[PDB]
Amino acid sequence: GAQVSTQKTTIHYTNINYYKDAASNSANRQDFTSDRVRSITLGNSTITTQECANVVVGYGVWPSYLQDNEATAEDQPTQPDVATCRFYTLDSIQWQKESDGWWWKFPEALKNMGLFGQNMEYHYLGRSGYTIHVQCNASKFHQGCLLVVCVPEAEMGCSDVEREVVAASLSSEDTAKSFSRTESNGQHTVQTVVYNAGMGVGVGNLTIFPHQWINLRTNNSATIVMPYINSVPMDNMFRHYNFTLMIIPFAKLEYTEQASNYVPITVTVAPMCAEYNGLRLASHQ
Amino acid sequence: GAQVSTQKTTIHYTNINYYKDAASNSANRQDFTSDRVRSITLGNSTITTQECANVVVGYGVWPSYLQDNEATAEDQPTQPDVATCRFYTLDSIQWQKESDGWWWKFPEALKNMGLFGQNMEYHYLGRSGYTIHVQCNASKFHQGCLLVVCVPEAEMGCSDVEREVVAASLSSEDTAKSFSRTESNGQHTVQTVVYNAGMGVGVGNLTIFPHQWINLRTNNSATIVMPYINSVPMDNMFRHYNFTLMIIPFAKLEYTEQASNYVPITVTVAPMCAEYNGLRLASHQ
Amino acid sequence: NYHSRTESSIENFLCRAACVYIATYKSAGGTPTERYASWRINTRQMVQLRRKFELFTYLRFDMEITFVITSTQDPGTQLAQDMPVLTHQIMYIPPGGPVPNSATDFAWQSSTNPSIFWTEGCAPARMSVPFISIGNAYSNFYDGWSHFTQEGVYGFNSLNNMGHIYVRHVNEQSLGVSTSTLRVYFKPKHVRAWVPRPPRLSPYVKSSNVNFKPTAVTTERKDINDVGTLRPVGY
Amino acid sequence: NYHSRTESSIENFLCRAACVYIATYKSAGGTPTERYASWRINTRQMVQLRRKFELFTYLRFDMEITFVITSTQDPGTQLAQDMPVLTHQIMYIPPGGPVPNSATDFAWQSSTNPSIFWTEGCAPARMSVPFISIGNAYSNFYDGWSHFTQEGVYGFNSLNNMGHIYVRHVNEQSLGVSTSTLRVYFKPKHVRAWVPRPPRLSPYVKSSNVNFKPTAVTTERKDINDVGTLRPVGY
Amino acid sequence: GLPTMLTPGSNQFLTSDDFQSPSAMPQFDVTPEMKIPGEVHNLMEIAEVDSVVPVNNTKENINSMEAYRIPVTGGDQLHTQVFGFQMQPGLNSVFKRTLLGEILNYYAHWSGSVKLTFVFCGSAMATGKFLLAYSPPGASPPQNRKQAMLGTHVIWDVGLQSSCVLCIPWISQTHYRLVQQDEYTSAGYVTCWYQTGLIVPPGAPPSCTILCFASACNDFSVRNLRDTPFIEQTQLLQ
Amino acid sequence: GLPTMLTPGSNQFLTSDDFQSPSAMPQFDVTPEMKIPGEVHNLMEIAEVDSVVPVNNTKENINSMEAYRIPVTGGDQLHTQVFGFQMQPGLNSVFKRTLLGEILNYYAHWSGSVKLTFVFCGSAMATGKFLLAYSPPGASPPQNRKQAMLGTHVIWDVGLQSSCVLCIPWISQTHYRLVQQDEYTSAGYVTCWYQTGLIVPPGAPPSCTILCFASACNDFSVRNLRDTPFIEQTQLLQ
Ligand SMILES: CCCCCCCCCCCCC/C=C/[C@H](O)[C@H](N)CO
Ligand SMILES: CCCCCCCCCCCCC/C=C/[C@H](O)[C@H](N)CO
C-alpha cells in the first residue's frame, strides 16, 4: 500500500491494487537491479569420446530426480539405477553422398532395448533424462559435416493438407526415417522435406535446441546430455514423445577414388535417472 | 478504516465501507486461520441396548433446555422432568418379506400417550428433544437390513398434482403409513413411492439426516438422540411436525422354511427436556 | 494434501446472482393490467436458483437485488418517429401495504416505500436488503399447516410473506406503444446455512408445494459389470 | 554499451492486445443459429498473435480479455425509424457445462458462469482471467496422441480444453433486424516463456495441426557476391 | 473536482462480483442470532457423508428399489465378477445422483481420494472372501481374478468383519481431472472378485445382498462452478 | 461526492496500456510452480544463438538445401570473391529469415555489433588463408583484394583453425539504424578474398564448403515494435 517507485525516463508513480485477486493487478514491467581420453561409465557400458571435446549439458541443467517438493503422484514405487542406465546402441544408419537426413523419437524408440521397454510397458507414468552420444569414425581425407539437434515437441506436419498423420509414418521401430530433399506426395505420410525440417520452420534455425556439430575435420563424435522437458511432471511414454533427434548433414561427404565409401553413423543413448509411477498389471502388448 | 489484508494468489487490497448499514458491505470471502449392557434410565422406564453399540447424538448436540439468553416468551410456566420423560412404546409394525417401509410424525404421534399429550393439549407453545430407540429381536439365520432416519421438515408431495394433502393421509394416529414400492393413484393422498422417499429426493440420499442401521448380522437395535431443530424457538405442536422417522428396509428379510416368520419392529421414543409456554384454558379437543 | 477448498465455501456457492423473475409490461392506454407488472417475492419461480437453496433447510443472508430492465418497440402504426429516453420506477410493497390498482394511481407517491427510479442506457439499478423476516431463519421447508385445526395451505407457503415488487413506467408516451421486460436478480451474501438435505431428484412442477412425479434413480447401463467402452467409438 | 534492453523483455513483447476472433450475429427471429455466436477458445485462429506464441514451447500467463462489440443496421424494409440502445451479453462456458441451443433459452440465467452485460456507447468491456489449466503450462506444442493405443487426434488439439464464449443479444427487437460483430482481444500479462523455438517459415493453413506446404528458405538475389545497388535507382 | 477517467468495465453487470451498494431498508435492526444445530460451513462436508450408490443400475432395476442391492450368490463360481465400474465420479451412471456426485456435478474439476465402503447384509453364519481391486487406467479392464490381483486390492473376510472399506487412491497425470472426464484425465476401473466362495450353512438362505457406500476422503477439492446438467425448466412455473 | 472531471482519454481502448481490471474467476487458486528448464527472460537471448545464414541465396539454390553452403574451390584464383553482402540485418535477403533477423524484424530499430563466424567444413589436410573485410559505407563496394585490405579485416588460416569469427563493428552516424535501412542510416558491405589459395593434397577432394553463422554480440538492442511483414492471412482459418 501507498507504494512509490521509478519509471523509465523526481518522477515517480503511485499505483495501488484495488482488487482481491492476484491476476487482477497490472503488468509489472519494472526491473530491480597412448593418449588420455575421458570415459563416461554409466550403468555397465562405457564410451570413449575425447579429451578436448566439449559436452553440451542440455538446457544448462543436469538430469536429476523428481523430488518430493514437486510431486503430484499418490504412491511412488522404485526406480532402478543399474538396470536401466546402460548405453544402449541403436541401429547403424549409413552415410552416403546424397543422404538427406535422419530422425528418431526416443520415448518410442527404446521400447525393445533392455528393461527400459520392460518398465514403461507396465507403469502408467514415466520420467527420464537422456545422454545421447552419436559417433562416426573419421579419417583425414573424408571431408564433410553434420548437425545433430534434440528438438523438443517436434510436431510434424502431414504430407497432404486436411489430413492427420499415422503412427506408422511418424515414428519407426528400429529405423530412422529419411528426409526427402524433395517433397513427399503421400496421402497420410509426413511432410518430410529437408529444407523445412518437418515442423515448417527454417532448417537453418534449428540451433536454439541443444545442438552439436560432428564436423569430420575437428570432431569424431558428439554427446548431448538432454534433460526431461515437459509441462506436466509425469506423462505416459506411449502416447507422448518427449523430444526428437535430427541428424541433418549440412555439407555432403566427398571422398576420393581410393577411399572408403561405407562410413557409418551410430547412436548410443542412455536414460539417466528413469522414474516410474502407477504400477498397473497391464502388460501393454 | 484503512484496512489492509491478503488475497488468494506484496499483493493486498484496501476496501472501505462507505455506508451506514451492516447489510450494505461486500461479501467477506476471506478466512482467518451374564454380560454387561448399558441401561439408559430416563423417567421411570429403562432400556437395554448393547455394550458395543454406538449411539448417534443428533446433529452433534445433546438435547438441552432453552435458556434465558434466547427466550422471546412473556411468562414461562413449569416443565416436568419425571411426568414426561418416560420411554413411551408405540405400536409394533410387522416386518414381512415384501414390506416397503414405514414412517411417523412425532409431535403428532404422542398425543395419546401419557401426559405429553396432556400438556401440549393446553399450552400454546412447545419444545422437546427426542431419544428414539427402535429395536427388532434378531437371530443368526434371519438375514436382512434396515435403515432408520429422522429427516427434519419432511415436506411430502401429494399423489395427484395441483392438489394439496390431507391431514388424515399425511399422518396417522397410532399406525405407520406404508411406502408403496409402486406409485399411489390417489386424488388427495400422499405420493408414497419408496424410491423417492416422499419428498422427491433420491432414497439413497437419506444419509445426511442423523441415521443408523439395524443390520440383522451385527446390530439388534438403534438409538438416535435427535435434538429440537426449528427456526423459531417455540412453535405449536398441532400445526407443525418437527421431524419424521423413516424406516426403509434396503435389503429384504429372507428366512428359511423352519424359521420364524413374525419378526416385529417397535419404536420406543422418549421426549427429553420438554418445555411449554402460554397456558390457555383451551382443552383443544 | 495442500489442496484446500476455497470455492467450495458457503459464500462462493451462493454469492452468485441468479435470475428470479421475467415480467413484461406495456406503456399504452387500455388494459391497465398491461401497464404495470406485479410480483410476489418468491425464490421458487426459477429452478436454477431453487435447487441451490433446497440443499439446506434453513438460511439467513443479506441480499443484493439488481434489475436489467430492457425495452422494445411494439409493431403496428403511429410509431414514435423519434423518442427520448424512458425511465422506469421499481417500488417495493411491504406485507400489509396499499397496492396500486393501475398506473397513474394515487398510491404511486411512495413516501414510506423504497422506490427507485432508473433511466435507460445506464448501469443496472442496485440495492441491498438485510435479513428481513419475523423468524430467525428463512425456512425453505415448513412441514406444517397454517391453522391450529390443521386446515389451510400446507408447506412452505405460509412463512413466505415478503410483499411484492410492482414496476411501472413513468412516461405518458403520447404517440407510441412500447413494452419492457424486468429481470430480477438475487445475490445473497453473508450466507449461513443450517441442516443440509439432499438435492431434488424429480423435476419441479409447482411453486406452491413439493409436488412431483415418481422418477427413476439414475440412468440405465448395460449390465451389473459394464465398464462402458474398452476401446474408442471408432471401428 | 549503455544501450540495455527494456522493450525486448518477455512482458513488452507479449503484453499487447491482439484480435483473436471475428463473430457475427443478427437479432431477428428465424434461423436461431444466427441469433447467437459461439467460439471455442483458441489462440490459433488469427495469425498475428499465433506467431508470437509459437516462438516458445510452453507459456504461463494471466490474461485481460476485451471486446469491441459494434453493430450495424440490416437492409430491407420494416426498419426501426427510432431505436433505443441495445445491450449485449457475453457468457463464458466452462469445459463440461450446458450450452444454450438458441437465444431466449432456459440456460441463459448463468448462475455459476461469469456472464457480463455491456451497453453500447460505453467503454469496451474488460475482465481478467488467471492461469487456468489442469497442467503447469499452456503447452503450445504437444507431440503426442490422445489415446494410449496411438489413435485419436494428434498435435496441440488435446490440451486446449478451455470451453467456449457464447454471445447473444438481450433485446427482443420487435420491429427491425440488426446484426452485430464481436472482436475478442487477448492481452497476456505476468508472462513466463519456456524453451524457445524458431519462427514458422511456412504460412499457416489450419487451426488443428502444423500442416504446411514446403516453402523456400529466403528470397533470391542475383549472384553469390551481389551487393545490391552501387548507385541509386536513377539514371 | 477530482478528474477521474472511466476505465473499461464501467456500467457493466458481471455476475460473480463483490461490490458495495446502498441499503433499501436503512437502520433496520434484525432478529437476534439463534444456534440452530448443524451449521454447515463448507459444501464439501456434505460430500464426506456416505450415500448408497446404485451399483446394480440395470434398466429394469433402476426404476425399482432393487438397484442398490448387489447380488452375492453362494456357490462355486471363482470366476464371476460381482461388480465393475469406471471410477468416474461425475459422468458414470453409478455415481452421479449420489451425494458425492451431486455436489461434484455443480463443480467442474474434481481432485481427491474417493472411499467406497461395501457393507454385507447377510446371515451371521455366512463366511467368504472378496478381492476388490482398483485397476489404474493402464490398458484394459480386469477380466479374470489373476488380472485383478496385480492392481491395488484388499481381501475382505465377510465373516470376520462386515463393512470393508477401499480408499481408491489418487494416481493421476494432472492435479485436477475434469468431472466430464475424457480419455485424457480419465480414471481407472474398479472391480470385485470371489476369493474363497461364500460358505452359508444349511439353516441360512444361500443368497446375500451387499450394498456400496461412496464418500470422498478428507483430501477432496473442487475447482470451478457451473450449471448442473440434471435439472431444467420450460416456463416460469406457477 | 467527489467532483471529478473526465479528462480526454476517457472511454478509449488504447492497446499498449497497463490498467487494472476485475477478475472473472474470483478466489481461483492456480497450479503450483514447476521449474521447466530454459526459462528465457528477454527476447534478445534468442538473438545471441547462432543460426546459419543462407549466403549462397541464388534463385535455383534457395529452394534447395545448397543455399547455406558457400563454395571455396581450390586452385590459383587470387581474384575471386567468395562472398559479399550489404550488412543490412533486416532487409537483406541473406539475413532476414535467420534467427537474428526474425526477432529483429519484429522490432523497428537495431543497434549493436553483429558477429559472423565462418566455419570450414573440409578435409583435415587442407590449408588456406582468407581475408574477410567489413568495408564501411564510404563509397563503392570492394572489387579487388587491394581495395578490401584498407577496410577492417581478419586473415584466417583455414588449416590452423576452423571457425574464424569476425565481430563487425558498430560505426554509425546515429545511435540507432532503422531495420528498413535507407541510403541514410545504412550499413557497409562485407566481403571475403583469397590470401594464399587453398592447398589440398592429392588424397583429398579439391573442393570444400564454408558455412556462415550470424548472432548479435552482447551489446545489441531493439527500440520499437511493429507487425512482421513476413507472415499474413486471408480469412479466419478453420
Ligand atoms: C429494491 C426494491 C425491492 C425490495 C425487495 C425486498 C427484499 C426482497 C425480499 C427478500 C427475499 C428473502 C429471501 C427468500 C425468502 C423466503 O424465505 C423464500 N421465498 C422461501 O420460499
Ligand atoms: C469474460 C468471459 C470469457 C472468459 C474466457 C475464459 C478465459 C479465456 C481462456 C484462456 C485462454 C488460455 C490461453 C491459451 C490456451 C491454450 O493453451 C492455447 N489455445 C493453445 O492452443
mmCIF file of N, CA, C and O and ligand atoms in Angstrom, chain D residues 41-44 53 61 63 65 67 90-92 114 116 127 129 132 138-140 156 159-160 162 165 186, chain F residues 24, ligand 2:
data_model
loop_
_atom_site.group_PDB
_atom_site.id
_atom_site.type_symbol
_atom_site.label_atom_id
_atom_site.label_comp_id
_atom_site.label_asym_id
_atom_site.label_seq_id
_atom_site.Cartn_x
_atom_site.Cartn_y
_atom_site.Cartn_z
ATOM 1 N N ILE D 41 -12.442 -21.468 -27.387
ATOM 2 C CA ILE D 41 -11.321 -20.572 -27.132
ATOM 3 C C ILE D 41 -10.013 -21.162 -27.632
ATOM 4 O O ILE D 41 -9.388 -21.986 -26.956
ATOM 5 N N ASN D 42 -9.594 -20.742 -28.819
ATOM 6 C CA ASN D 42 -8.256 -20.990 -29.314
ATOM 7 C C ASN D 42 -7.461 -19.696 -29.257
ATOM 8 O O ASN D 42 -7.991 -18.620 -28.977
ATOM 9 N N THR D 43 -6.166 -19.805 -29.523
ATOM 10 C CA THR D 43 -5.372 -18.672 -29.964
ATOM 11 C C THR D 43 -4.902 -18.871 -31.391
ATOM 12 O O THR D 43 -4.151 -18.038 -31.909
ATOM 13 N N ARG D 44 -5.333 -19.949 -32.036
ATOM 14 C CA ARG D 44 -4.798 -20.396 -33.308
ATOM 15 C C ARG D 44 -5.609 -19.905 -34.497
ATOM 16 O O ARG D 44 -5.287 -20.254 -35.635
ATOM 17 N N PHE D 53 3.099 -16.428 -30.106
ATOM 18 C CA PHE D 53 3.090 -17.516 -29.135
ATOM 19 C C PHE D 53 3.994 -18.656 -29.569
ATOM 20 O O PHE D 53 4.665 -19.266 -28.731
ATOM 21 N N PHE D 61 0.597 -17.469 -18.206
ATOM 22 C CA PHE D 61 0.284 -16.055 -18.082
ATOM 23 C C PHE D 61 -1.121 -15.853 -17.539
ATOM 24 O O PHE D 61 -1.956 -16.758 -17.555
ATOM 25 N N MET D 63 -4.440 -13.189 -18.129
ATOM 26 C CA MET D 63 -4.928 -12.553 -19.343
ATOM 27 C C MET D 63 -5.923 -11.442 -19.049
ATOM 28 O O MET D 63 -6.511 -11.369 -17.968
ATOM 29 N N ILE D 65 -9.079 -9.950 -21.154
ATOM 30 C CA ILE D 65 -9.939 -10.088 -22.320
ATOM 31 C C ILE D 65 -10.802 -8.847 -22.466
ATOM 32 O O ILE D 65 -11.337 -8.321 -21.484
ATOM 33 N N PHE D 67 -13.567 -6.695 -25.490
ATOM 34 C CA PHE D 67 -14.468 -6.897 -26.616
ATOM 35 C C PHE D 67 -14.924 -5.551 -27.150
ATOM 36 O O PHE D 67 -15.517 -4.762 -26.411
ATOM 37 N N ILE D 90 -22.236 -11.377 -22.808
ATOM 38 C CA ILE D 90 -21.126 -12.273 -23.102
ATOM 39 C C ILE D 90 -21.018 -13.282 -21.971
ATOM 40 O O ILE D 90 -20.768 -12.903 -20.822
ATOM 41 N N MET D 91 -21.194 -14.562 -22.290
ATOM 42 C CA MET D 91 -21.179 -15.620 -21.288
ATOM 43 C C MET D 91 -20.028 -16.573 -21.550
ATOM 44 O O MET D 91 -19.876 -17.080 -22.663
ATOM 45 N N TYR D 92 -19.223 -16.816 -20.521
ATOM 46 C CA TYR D 92 -18.233 -17.878 -20.584
ATOM 47 C C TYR D 92 -18.874 -19.207 -20.203
ATOM 48 O O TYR D 92 -19.679 -19.281 -19.273
ATOM 49 N N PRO D 114 -19.585 -16.803 -15.496
ATOM 50 C CA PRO D 114 -19.304 -15.371 -15.334
ATOM 51 C C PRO D 114 -19.765 -14.523 -16.510
ATOM 52 O O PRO D 114 -18.942 -14.024 -17.282
ATOM 53 N N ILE D 116 -21.376 -11.228 -18.503
ATOM 54 C CA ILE D 116 -21.144 -9.793 -18.411
ATOM 55 C C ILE D 116 -22.045 -9.084 -19.416
ATOM 56 O O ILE D 116 -22.076 -9.445 -20.598
ATOM 57 N N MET D 127 -12.308 -7.912 -18.576
ATOM 58 C CA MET D 127 -12.235 -8.839 -17.459
ATOM 59 C C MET D 127 -10.830 -9.421 -17.405
ATOM 60 O O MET D 127 -10.097 -9.380 -18.397
ATOM 61 N N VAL D 129 -8.644 -12.962 -16.341
ATOM 62 C CA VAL D 129 -8.716 -14.385 -16.034
ATOM 63 C C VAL D 129 -7.330 -14.872 -15.628
ATOM 64 O O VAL D 129 -6.320 -14.425 -16.193
ATOM 65 N N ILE D 132 -5.454 -20.583 -16.016
ATOM 66 C CA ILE D 132 -6.470 -21.611 -15.829
ATOM 67 C C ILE D 132 -6.135 -22.771 -16.763
ATOM 68 O O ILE D 132 -6.297 -22.689 -17.986
ATOM 69 N N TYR D 138 0.652 -23.666 -20.350
ATOM 70 C CA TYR D 138 -0.088 -23.724 -21.602
ATOM 71 C C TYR D 138 0.840 -24.223 -22.697
ATOM 72 O O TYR D 138 1.576 -23.432 -23.292
ATOM 73 N N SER D 139 0.826 -25.523 -22.964
ATOM 74 C CA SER D 139 1.723 -26.081 -23.964
ATOM 75 C C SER D 139 1.253 -25.717 -25.365
ATOM 76 O O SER D 139 0.125 -26.033 -25.755
ATOM 77 N N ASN D 140 2.118 -25.043 -26.121
ATOM 78 C CA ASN D 140 1.818 -24.674 -27.495
ATOM 79 C C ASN D 140 2.087 -25.792 -28.489
ATOM 80 O O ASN D 140 1.667 -25.687 -29.644
ATOM 81 N N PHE D 156 -1.492 -30.265 -30.972
ATOM 82 C CA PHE D 156 -1.868 -29.426 -29.841
ATOM 83 C C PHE D 156 -3.345 -29.516 -29.498
ATOM 84 O O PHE D 156 -3.756 -28.957 -28.477
ATOM 85 N N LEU D 159 -4.872 -30.622 -25.379
ATOM 86 C CA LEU D 159 -4.787 -29.901 -24.120
ATOM 87 C C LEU D 159 -5.399 -28.511 -24.219
ATOM 88 O O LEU D 159 -5.292 -27.723 -23.274
ATOM 89 N N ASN D 160 -6.031 -28.192 -25.345
ATOM 90 C CA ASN D 160 -6.791 -26.956 -25.496
ATOM 91 C C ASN D 160 -8.240 -27.285 -25.149
ATOM 92 O O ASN D 160 -9.087 -27.522 -26.012
ATOM 93 N N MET D 162 -10.669 -25.291 -23.131
ATOM 94 C CA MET D 162 -10.914 -24.030 -22.392
ATOM 95 C C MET D 162 -12.366 -23.604 -22.568
ATOM 96 O O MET D 162 -12.687 -22.467 -22.210
ATOM 97 N N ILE D 165 -16.965 -19.132 -25.531
ATOM 98 C CA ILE D 165 -17.599 -17.834 -25.170
ATOM 99 C C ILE D 165 -18.816 -17.724 -26.078
ATOM 100 O O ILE D 165 -18.614 -17.649 -27.297
ATOM 101 N N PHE D 186 -6.987 -10.609 -26.723
ATOM 102 C CA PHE D 186 -6.238 -11.253 -25.652
ATOM 103 C C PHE D 186 -4.965 -10.464 -25.385
ATOM 104 O O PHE D 186 -4.168 -10.242 -26.303
ATOM 105 N N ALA F 24 -12.612 -12.367 -13.468
ATOM 106 C CA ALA F 24 -13.762 -13.174 -13.852
ATOM 107 C C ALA F 24 -13.816 -14.498 -13.113
ATOM 108 O O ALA F 24 -14.894 -15.091 -12.994
HETATM 109 C C1 LIG G 2 -15.121 -12.933 -19.692
HETATM 110 C C2 LIG G 2 -15.823 -14.140 -20.306
HETATM 111 C C3 LIG G 2 -14.879 -15.011 -21.133
HETATM 112 C C4 LIG G 2 -13.859 -15.736 -20.260
HETATM 113 C C5 LIG G 2 -12.960 -16.618 -21.119
HETATM 114 C C6 LIG G 2 -12.138 -17.576 -20.268
HETATM 115 C C7 LIG G 2 -10.645 -17.268 -20.326
HETATM 116 C C8 LIG G 2 -10.094 -17.422 -21.736
HETATM 117 C C9 LIG G 2 -9.316 -18.720 -21.882
HETATM 118 C C10 LIG G 2 -7.830 -18.508 -21.641
HETATM 119 C C11 LIG G 2 -7.009 -18.962 -22.840
HETATM 120 C C12 LIG G 2 -5.683 -19.544 -22.372
HETATM 121 C C13 LIG G 2 -4.540 -19.185 -23.312
HETATM 122 C C14 LIG G 2 -4.397 -20.239 -24.383
HETATM 123 C C15 LIG G 2 -4.760 -21.636 -24.104
HETATM 124 C C16 LIG G 2 -4.210 -22.761 -24.932
HETATM 125 O O1 LIG G 2 -3.017 -23.239 -24.351
HETATM 126 C C17 LIG G 2 -3.911 -22.298 -26.351
HETATM 127 N N1 LIG G 2 -5.155 -22.138 -27.077
HETATM 128 C C18 LIG G 2 -3.028 -23.313 -27.065
HETATM 129 O O2 LIG G 2 -3.623 -23.682 -28.290
#
